[PDB]
């Protein structure tokens, strides 16, 4: 084949720097990018109305936590609405995030759509006019983006079509982000749903990630300028066999070593409906696994950083400080777990043990 | 692999019937789907303002031509704006088209976008919310759609990435149309630009169409419910060697026999900046080619049906009838040429001999 | 992409002529290419020793049948040993075949080998030094070759790997034959084993043949110079639902129209353990199917032309003429069935109704 | 997709152990596997007859060098003939190699063959009966194998077909080795021929290696049980621009980080017609490159370990010891260079500075 270089040297240097800053040692990502429909369900649980103001106040509570959180969070993923909101003190949230050391990110996909002729498999849409939105977001403060693809384990799933198509669409979104100075987080999520055992999840994760990195190569994507956000390798939600944290860790780190090139700057796990603590305990075993792990291995957590906070908050403005503390507890814990220095040992208040699992068809 | 049938038997029967009606013997397609920006250039040429009303009047002039045109046109491709306009007598254009025997079609792509890391190659966008637009259009009278992909011949073009990506995106659009009862016209256009000879165009067309039909198979597309709209195989615009019409015909029909399955219902050529007459003369040689041609071989022409009409019209309302006649001449001629019964022999007024070639980068 | 033409015009003309002569109207193929190990089992059934001489005598009995067979057989596929044997009158068998109007063919594969990490799937070997063997065989009288690949229908079979790998290896063998003036018969056999219904066989056949024709395109194979030898689409051996001959015919011809380009010169079905008569009755329905069938649709039968002959022969030299008649009956019948002119109506002696099914693992 | 595990746990453990032992720190590979035709040219250069005995004596001179070589050589690749020869003291060479700490390897490919319809591109043959040869070789003392594929940089080379086909055939050979307890060395050589600059070699190497690791994944190959033998990234032989050793090192290590998973056990470079010293100097810069190199980075050298030895030997039995010393010099140097501890600084006798470049068409 033949080169017509996608990016210049300076564009490459800019992408590699943003990627590296996000997952610097001790740091992970807050995923705060729930659309209106999905944050509505979380506000319902605490009997709070889904208005714009409550969404603004709840995001302000996460983003203005005290400075124990600054070395813990390298990046915060926002939903379009929040990127344009302001804290009570007048500053725009992107400014709030950057003044505490963080990089601002934006969810740019437009959700999943059905693949015809499949057993309920999806691809994800959002490419239309993506270039133009990325250039606006970059001007508005965001340096990284996020696009989620969803695969399912089943008797005949994932299919070759679902794998191919989802890999190809992640590569297209990645190319378009890099052109506009934004680091793409590639997220090929394999759902936990079903009763498969640890080893089926591990084999399917290996096959999906191999298709992903071939697609990214075919689309000329600069890997040092990307991050990956995969599922850990766990057994299925309904699996009756029990696996230990070190088995989850070994499986995960062995699946990643077989597929992800050492040039990828880091890997930022999703939590997948693991509880707050379980999600920290698995991250910490992953980072204690004796194999050579040539990339950062950190967190990009949504529900596993927010659950105790949401429940402490309760929609009451006077619980603000109790709610922030509960998030700061979890941020400290995952900042230790991504270094393999997390000590479960009671400690802290000790964030939720309640599962955050929701089942991911229509739901 | 394993079946979860994309379509039911009745959905299949509906798709095959619409496809077959469009390209019934003697019939072809009027492409009248120029967006606002592209019809502006044609109205400029005749010193006429690009307002909505002039666009409405000019489309009315094509769509209400007398009944010599009824057996000639099986289908008319419209731009979104026109699908909602009305003739002077109060009827909506879809109604005008159907009362004269025609099937209404709608352009649903949103144009081409650059592929990074390539020598100026494009893919085409428009998938976002395509399902929802197709279901509305189907309710509003359209039964078929059109989506154009553009490839270029050059020293290192088309690339494997451009071929793969364009094939995959045509397959996605096709799947989504079939789900909503619309027959997709798949259009993998290979531009005429450049100085390549007939045999390079033929080899590139064979390679592109093979990738297209594999992609459509991987996406489970029902082929009897589709039409193809390819370029004829011609030498490049700047090629100095001269080829005859029978060489153009043989090359074209030999490239199609090697790639397009007999299940495809028909093939509706684009004109590509050939003049009105040349476009008719090539169609008629294609349909006189002695090889076995197991699909309809007809026209889906934009500029090659409209040029003499536009020039006769001149933006003057009193030339209406002179302008219609000029379109009806061309419609009769292509209705004969798709049967291999067209007699060039002076005849008619004899539509333009002027090339309609425009060069297809920014332009 | 870019051309460095695999073949010259004269090489192409030679290949297309041999292909067309083999499947001229009324003609089919005798597959007489059982290796030593497989003809041993057939000679055991008639209590006859598997010596070289009995193998020679039995092949002589097929190849010197009287001239009712001349217009019926366009081609005869031999095993390497037989290509070098002589009839009792001194002539080499290739000479015997050619003097009766036939084209000589040679089996050049070296059997199937296991694909690791699969549920018992195979690929087929034989490429090593294939070029050199083809050039010798061409000098020794053969003009076409045969290479068999085997796929299986099961819960997770065929796999994507089995499909891909078998398609790729057929394309390699085809390229190498064409370079040496030999027409390759491409044989992607999907076994009848298992209890799947007609529609699973049809879907799997469509997916396999699409991968095959894409592979042949990627390897630059001249399609007019090839023949295909696929399975008809039938339900599985152990399927309890019953399908009629016209359902078998429709399924088959609908699967072929969706995948096989009109340039392929012909399609020469295998029998697959159908009895002599059933194999003739299905061929004749296939050729009565009302759809447009743009290629020859004929037979390349092994067991379905030989069973009554073998049993009449019995290893006794005095039954020679009774055995030949029994083969000539079957040759006449398939020559009518490939024209859709076969009349079952008792008639003839009426060749075996006994199934020729053997189950195709180790066996 | 779905698992039917290619290998058991114990087979995996055996493969990973052999792979790891070969490229233990300080160790590299002697490639002594020149076929008869290729060692003939090297014996001609020193006016020595190409008999079996001289081939035996010359291999004995390499394999019985004194024990300074034991910690330097983890593995020795032999040609089939040599695997069955004996040293003068009666021991079989495999025994000689193992008693000095080494692992015995065997070349199992059967050379390259032309790909039709390409600009002189090749694939490589040798799969036929590979399973059976691997099981014999394993019994005869070999634990690893070697199979070389050759790609060329040119105006339209490598083509997509050449890349695909060569990747697929390396994956097939690898699968078959692993089944028989042999560690496959995968060697996708990109020739140095031509006038391309460093950056074209680097881009082509990235594209080839991405296709290779996808193919190995599709064929279920256990990566911990493999080694890679690629070209370093250098400019072309006829390139007029000059590049430094650190540019060669950076390019090489940046191309490998982008494509080769961390599970691959090691990477054993070929020399490619670099002189003895240049080949050591590049290995040592590669291993001083500041980036994270998660696999061993060592040598699998043929001509770059033998040139001064061959020339000192001269076919004279009395120069034996002078010839061995000359090989031991080079072995020490590459054992230091694979640790990034090699000091060019005059030193030693100082092995050839003469280029070992031969041009690799017919030649």
Swiss-Prot record, chains A, B, C, D:
Signal peptide residue numbers: none
Recorded coiled-coil stretches: none
Pfam families on file: Glycolytic
InterPro entries: Aldolase_I_AS, Aldolase_TIM, FBA_I
Catalytic reactions of this protein: beta-D-fructose 1,6-bisphosphate = D-glyceraldehyde 3-phosphate + dihydroxyacetone phosphate
Cross-link Glycyl lysine isopeptide (Lys-Gly) (interchain with G-Cter in SUMO1) residue location(s): 41
UniProt entry keywords in alphabetical sequence: Acetylation, Cytoplasm, Disease variant, Glycogen storage disease, Glycolysis, Hereditary hemolytic anemia, Hydroxylation, Isopeptide bond, Lyase, Phosphoprotein, Schiff base, Ubl conjugation
Keyword flag Lyase: yes
Phosphotyrosine modified-residue sites: 4
UniProt superkingdom: Eukaryota
Purpose: Catalyzes the reversible conversion of beta-D-fructose 1,6-bisphosphate (FBP) into two triose phosphate and plays a key role in glycolysis and gluconeogenesis. In addition, may also function as scaffolding protein.
Subunit structure and binding partners: Homotetramer. Interacts with SNX9 and WAS. Interacts with FBP2; the interaction blocks FBP2 inhibition by physiological concentrations of AMP and reduces inhibition by Ca(2+).
Protein name: Fructose-bisphosphate aldolase A
Species for this entry: Homo sapiens
């Amino acid at each position: 084949p033949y080169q017509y270089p996608a990016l210049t040297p300076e564009q490459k240097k800019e992408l590699s720097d943003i990627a590296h800053r996000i997952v610097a040692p001790g740091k992970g990502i807050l995923a705060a990018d729930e659309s209106t429909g999905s944050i509505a369900k979380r506000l319902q649980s605490i009997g709070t109305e889904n208005t714009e103001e409550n969404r603004r106040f709840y995001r302000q509570l996460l983003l203005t936590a005290d400075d124990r959180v600054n070395p813990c969070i390298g990046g915060v993923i926002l939903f379009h609405e929040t990127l344009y909101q302001k804290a009570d003190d007048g500053r725009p949230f992107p400014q709030v995030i950057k003044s505490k050391g963080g990089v601002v990110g934006i969810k740019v996909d437009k959700g999943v759509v059905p693949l015809a002729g499949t057993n309920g498999e999806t691809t994800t849409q959002g490419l239309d006019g993506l270039s133009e939105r990325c250039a606006q977001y970059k001007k508005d403060g965001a340096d990284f983006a996020k696009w989620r693809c969803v695969l399912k384990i089943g008797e005949h799933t994932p299919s070759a079509l679902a794998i191919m198509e989802n890999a190809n669409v992640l590569a297209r979104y990645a190319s378009i982000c890099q052109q506009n100075g934004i680091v793409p987080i590639v997220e090929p999520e394999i759902l936990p749903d079903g009763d498969h055992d640890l080893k089926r999840c591990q084999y399917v994760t290996e096959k999906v990630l191999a298709a992903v990195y071939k697609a990214l190569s075919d689309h000329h994507i600069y890997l040092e300028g990307t991050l990956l956000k995969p599922n850990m390798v766990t057994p299925g939600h309904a699996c009756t066999q029990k696996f230990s944290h070190e088995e989850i860790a070994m499986a995960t780190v062995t699946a990643l070593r077989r597929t992800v090139p050492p040039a990828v700057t880091g890997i930022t796990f999703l939590s997948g409906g693991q509880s707050e603590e379980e999600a920290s305990i698995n991250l910490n075993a992953i980072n204690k696994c004796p194999l050579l792990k040539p990339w950062a291995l950190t967190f990009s957590y949504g529900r596993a950083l927010q659950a105790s906070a949401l429940k402490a908050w309760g929609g009451k403005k006077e619980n603000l400080k109790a709610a922030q503390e509960e998030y700061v507890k979890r941020a400290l814990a995952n900042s230790l777990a991504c270094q393999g220095k997390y000590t479960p040992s009671g400690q802290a208040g000790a964030a939720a043990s309640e599962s955050l699992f929701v089942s991911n068809h229509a739901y």
